[PDB]
Design a binder for these strands. Structure first.
Lengths: 166, 120, 178, 232
RNA sequence: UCGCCCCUGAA
RNA sequence: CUUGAGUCUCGUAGAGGGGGGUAGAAUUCCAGGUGUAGCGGUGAAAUGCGUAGAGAUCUGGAGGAAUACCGGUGGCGAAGGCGGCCCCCUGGACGAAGACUGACGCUCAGGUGCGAAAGCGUGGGGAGCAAACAGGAUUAGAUACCCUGGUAGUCCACGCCGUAAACGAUGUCGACUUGGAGGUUGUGCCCUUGAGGCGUGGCUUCCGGAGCUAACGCGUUAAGUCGACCGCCUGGGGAGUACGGCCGCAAGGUUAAAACUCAAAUGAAUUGACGGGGGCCCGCACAAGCGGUGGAGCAUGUGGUUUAAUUCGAUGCAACGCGAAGAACCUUACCUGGUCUUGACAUCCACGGAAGUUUUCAGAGAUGAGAAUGUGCCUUCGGGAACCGUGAGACAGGUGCUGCAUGGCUGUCGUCAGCUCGUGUUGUGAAAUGUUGGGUUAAGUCCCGCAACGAGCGCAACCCUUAUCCUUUGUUGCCAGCGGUCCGGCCGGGAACUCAAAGGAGACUGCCAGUGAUAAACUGGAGGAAGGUGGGGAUGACGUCAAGUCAUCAUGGCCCUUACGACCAGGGCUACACACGUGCUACAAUGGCGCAUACAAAGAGAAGCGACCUCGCGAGAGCAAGCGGACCUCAUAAAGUGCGUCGUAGUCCGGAUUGGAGUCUGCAACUCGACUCCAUGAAGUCGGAAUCGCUAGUAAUCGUGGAUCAGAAUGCCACGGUGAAUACGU
């Protein structure tokens, strides 16, 4: 994709951070992996999974890859414009728009991912097994998938032209 | 040209000859490349459907012909021709080597015209 | 597991036969890696043979040994399809080795003074098959010709036979013997 | 054990010896002991300059105080007053008189011992452990070296586990016989235990230091081999 | 084809 | 009203269901014939069966059960399920024109019917197989798998029970949504001029798109996208059990809990690991060979045991001739006793004395107390500096304890061809790709291909050394051409030659042919001293084993403080009734002993080796040259060889044990030194079960030297001599 870490407006942030393992021929190795997001407070948000032998380069590489998995989002107000109740992976995702005068209200991944993405008055919820790692798939289920007033308005405008043409 | 002058023995110079010439055989064709491409015609989708993925994870436009197992993706201007170049090679001679090869004959004249407006 | 050809030994011609075959008969009669002490007995026993028998210098060994060597040696390997250990028809080179070895073994079953006199008299009785070193032959060759199930490993081999054209009886094995 | 440390001929005819001297039949023992003793006191009483490595050269009528540093400007100080004091230590222990000699000038991003003691002193101020080497390797690779491979023993945080902190960057083959393989060690002696340090800098890659720059002798290319004459 | 079991724990 | 549903008509195909007939093959029984000593079974066996005639083989007769092939993801049924052939009765499905009915439909708790196999009751039938059962076998045991028999049962009729991983682990019905290929069965069309070419329905596999799924995958016959109705689940174990009800003749089935107890149980997938899973490839891994050990004695270590101590640590291989490269005292940590306490060893502070030198006594010395003598370096002449003793503390010392606090070092798989990483892509992720595949090599080696592209470590690489030939330098080394001769490289001469050892030449699949994708490579060939990682070293990765080592050394914590520290004399380490590990020496004539005789290499050396000459049986001692050296000495190499003998005996083999007499090295050799001399003369006549090494200058065997060392090698380490067998083949 394209950069989401941009001078004078960058909004670096992290999500997960942990270690994972592979069982090698000898002993067992540890790969320092982590999820990140850089925002701008205006959308443009992504995610990356680094692999490293150290925690700093785990976040380095994950923010490289964050820019390579940027998704665009555009909105008005401090809240998302459309509810998306879609589910990606086995973590169940829900997402309402909500009037200003309320917080993010979420302790999971979607506390921080729903901050960087220019939203902070959104109300969201999740069901199913607790697992922050795929709460992050609310990139798919709300930011990537959306509707906007001028999208729906051009449905109503497309139809009129066809009747005239015949 | 210095592999027989920095290596002065058979146990070195002719060891280097073997290993080098059978790299340049096919890597030859990718060292004639210039800068980063802005266009990428394809003629296949058996092993050139790599293009329609990666150069649309980056958005460098892929110009793809009609396919028998796939749909073009990117900024596509379809042209007669199908996937598999083992059964459409002779066809490409006067199809896509006559619209995309001449896709440059036409472009050069238009490019000259555009430069003239800028100059004035 | 074994890569490329085996070694070959180039050895000297004898100073009384010119042979490398009967140089290999000094080699068998070496002990403690001394060819010096070996060569003694060899010639001492050559003479003993010449007196006690007719023969010739290339028949005092040669002919006598061609009555001690079997043409089949039975080796070992657990597989056989009956837990059998298979006959192996030996190459003419390995024929030599067997008989040569056994004649020296036979002189350690004797106590008839020296070592020359031992193997000499033994070789004199070994050309008419009335020795005790020719009776070693009569167990290797007796076995082999009275019992066979060949080099096939019967269960494994049978599957291979069946696939090729349809058989259960002996033929070359197309499939694995693994 | 896990690493057997191959360096026994990498400093042979592949790179120079670090204590070149000669001794005769009953002098072997003496010359050995005397040299090593001096070096202990020497290296300890100097710490105001960044020691590349002490070396000595003993003509066996003098010994040469040939300390090398990356900062000779602190070694000299004012006048000769500094170096004088140090020279005396040598003269005392070793049975010969002694003479002051050169200390190297060049960037401190060279020599394994230069990079060793620097980060070791850092650990003894109880700052950096993992991170120690990393800074010193971005340095070392920036200018100088042709690959570095550091080893450091993990003991950090008051944790009581035996660990190995192993970081390389650039190429270090350990078996190249046509390259200047550097190798020195340091050790911290913190309250977290003992932290061994090993710095292996692959300074050369195709050029030796004693496989290059030497003079052999013979083939003199003369068809006559001179003989005494006269007849009697 | 030649049966054939049994094995306290955190690096 | 007809699109849903249903009927009518005409055909179509099929192991649909039920009933009754019928054929042959095979096994078995019975009968007869032929023929004789085995049969049968198994990995081997045994039980069993045979001369009273089996097995096999042939002929006749009889019976029971099942129908080889056919035969296929082929077909049919609601499901369960259903196979030789024929008849009868009978059900379902589908298609084709039309024709008709006119939502009559869909689903369904209850209810009702159908139920593989086993089981149960009743009556028939009984060949084979087979629970049970009985021998045999395998196994430590084997109430089993395995073998030989064999009963209920399986089979038929009728009734009953109603379960099954009753499966597509997928409720049924209706509706939709890319396609491709095959199978099967109707029917329309096309010079049907092609068994078929093009359609269109029904059913059935495989593939796969979108989508869905956590993934595997499902994928128009859905796990996709919808609706309708019903059934079920709501953590696991407890338990499909208890309790009650229901059903059954019963066996049991059916409905169906709770107490209690646990923080998981569980599904899918990832990488490695393992498999008596498979495929592939190597190594003395095996086969084929050669040589040992375990037997015996001695040497050496260890365990056990004992002792005041037998100082400590190591624990298959990778501990146990290891740390320890020689333990008389010391060493030495251990014991017993003597003895000291800021100290034997350090710094600093204070005092005196410079340290010392030669001697005395007591004592086992450690020491303790003296007797004389010394006044260097500087000085202000006191004092200090080195240094010594004593005092005092802060301290010092500790091979004291933790290798589960650690460093450093090392072993280990393994000289293994593997091991990773960056970047991109793929996957929600763990991760994957690469690194896999097709060839090939010793090699992640090289080539080709393939979402991989690059790179690092390891292999290889470059380094040494050796196999040749050349170059220098020729003394203490060489001696041809040249002379002496003393005939000896001993002297001159000659540097040619060997030799030394520094530097080069050389080998790279380089070249030739074939083979191999024309690729790498492989097989022969040539040239050469040598071909195909030439041979041997160094080279031993990143790691794993909380492997070892606080006792080489270092060090976090801990402990001892007129001591656990320190020093000394004696003793213990070499006890000992034994066991184990690693070696060495024999058991002999290819040898022993006696004579004479052949040639070595590489190291060592003024606490040293020591020629010569003298003496000693000897070990060795005296006398003494030489040597820090291609000088001289250790050094006489030994097996070997030519002769003398002995004759297969426990001996002319073998050498243990002990005594006496001597030697040497040391202050002194008593436990606890080695060598020699003479005597005594051992066990053993060549070693089970078992187990180990080795593919060539190796094995084997024979000596020699070195370190450690005042003085102790059957050990370790190194050097040469002579010098194989065997390898089809994995």
């Amino acid at each position: 994709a394209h950069i989401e870490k941009q001078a004078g407006e960058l909004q670096e942030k992290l999500i997960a951070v942990n270690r994972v393992s592979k069982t090698v021929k000898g002993g067992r190795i540890f790969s320092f992996t982590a999820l990140t997001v850089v925002g701008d407070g205006n959308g443009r948000v992504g995610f990356g999974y680094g692999k490293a032998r150290e925690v700093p380069a785990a976040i380095q590489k994950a923010m490289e890859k964050a820019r390579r998995n940027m998704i665009n989002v555009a909105l008005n107000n401090g809240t998302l414009q459309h509810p998306v109740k879609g589910v990606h992976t086995g973590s169940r995702v829900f997402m309402q728009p909500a009037s200003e005068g309320t917080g993010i209200i979420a302790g999971g991944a979607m506390r921080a991912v729903l901050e960087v993405a220019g939203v902070h008055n959104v109300l969201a919820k999740a069901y199913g097994s607790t697992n922050p790692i795929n709460v992050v798939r609310a990139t798919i289920d709300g930011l990537e998938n959306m509707n906007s007033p001028e999208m729906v308005a051009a449905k109503r405008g497309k139809s009129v032209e066809e009747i005239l043409g015949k | 040209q210095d592999g027989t002058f920095d290596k002065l023995t058979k146990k070195e110079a002719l060891m280097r000859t073997r290993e080098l010439e059978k790299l340049e055989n096919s890597l030859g064709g990718i060292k004639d490349m210039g800068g980063l491409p802005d266009a990428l015609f394809v003629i296949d989708a058996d092993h050139e459907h790599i293009a329609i993925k990666e150069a649309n994870n980056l958005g460098i436009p892929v110009f793809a012909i009609v396919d028998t197992n796939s749909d073009p993706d990117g900024v596509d201007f379809v042209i007669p021709g199908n996937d598999d170049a083992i059964r459409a090679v002779t066809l490409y001679l006067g199809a896509v080597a006559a619209t995309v090869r001449e896709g440059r004959s036409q472009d050069l004249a238009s490019q000259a015209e555009e430069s003239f407006v800028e100059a004035e | 597991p074994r890569r490329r050809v085996i070694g070959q030994r180039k050895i000297l011609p004898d100073p009384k036969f010119g042979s490398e075959l009967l140089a290999k008969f000094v080699n068998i009669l070496m002990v403690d890696g001394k060819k010096s002490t070996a060569e003694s007995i060899v010639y001492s026993a050559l003479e003993t043979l010449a007196q006690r028998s007719g023969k010739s210098e290339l028949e005092a060994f040669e002919v006598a040994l061609e009555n001690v060597r079997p043409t089949v040696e039975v080796k070992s390997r657990r597989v056989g399809g009956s837990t059998y250990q298979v006959p192996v028809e030996v190459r003419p080179v390995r024929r030599n080795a067997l008989a040569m070895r056994w004649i020296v073994e036979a002189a350690r079953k004797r106590g008839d003074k020296s070592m020359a006199l031992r193997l000499a008299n033994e070789l004199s009785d070994a050309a008419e098959n009335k020795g005790t070193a020719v009776k070693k032959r009569e167990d290797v060759h007796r076995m082999a010709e009275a019992n066979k199930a060949f080099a096939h490993y019967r269960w494994l081999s049978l599957r291979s036979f069946s696939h090729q054209a349809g058989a259960s009886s002996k033929q070359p094995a197309l499939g694995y013997l693994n | 054990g896990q690493k057997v440390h191959p360096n026994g001929i990498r400093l042979g005819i592949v790179k120079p010896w670090n204590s070149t001297w000669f001794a005769n039949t009953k002098e072997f023992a003496d010359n050995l002991d005397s040299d090593f003793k001096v070096r202990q006191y020497l290296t300890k009483e100097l710490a105001k300059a960044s020691v590349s490595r002490i070396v000595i050269e003993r003509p066996a009528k003098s010994i040469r105080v040939t300390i090398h540093t990356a900062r000779p400007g602190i070694v000299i100080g004012k006048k000769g007053e500094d170096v004088e004091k140090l020279r005396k230590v040598v003269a005392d222990i070793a049975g010969v008189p002694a003479q002051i000699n050169i200390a190297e000038v060049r960037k401190p991003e060279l020599d394994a011992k230069l990079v060793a003691d620097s980060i070791t002193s850092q650990l003894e101020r109880r700052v950096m452990f993992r991170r120690a080497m990393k800074r010193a390797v971005q340095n070392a690779m920036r200018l100088g070296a042709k690959g570095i491979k550091v080893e450091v023993s993990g003991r950090l945080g008051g944790a009581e586990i035996a660990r190995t902190e192993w970081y390389r960057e650039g190429r270090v083959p350990l078996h190249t016989l046509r390259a200047d393989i550097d190798y020195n060690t340091s050790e911290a002696h913190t309250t977290y235990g003992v932290i061994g340090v090993k710095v292996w800098i692959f300074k050369g890659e195709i050029l030796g230091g004693m496989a290059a720059v030497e003079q052999p002798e013979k083939p003199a290319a003369q068809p006559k081999k001179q003989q005494r004459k006269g007849r009697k």
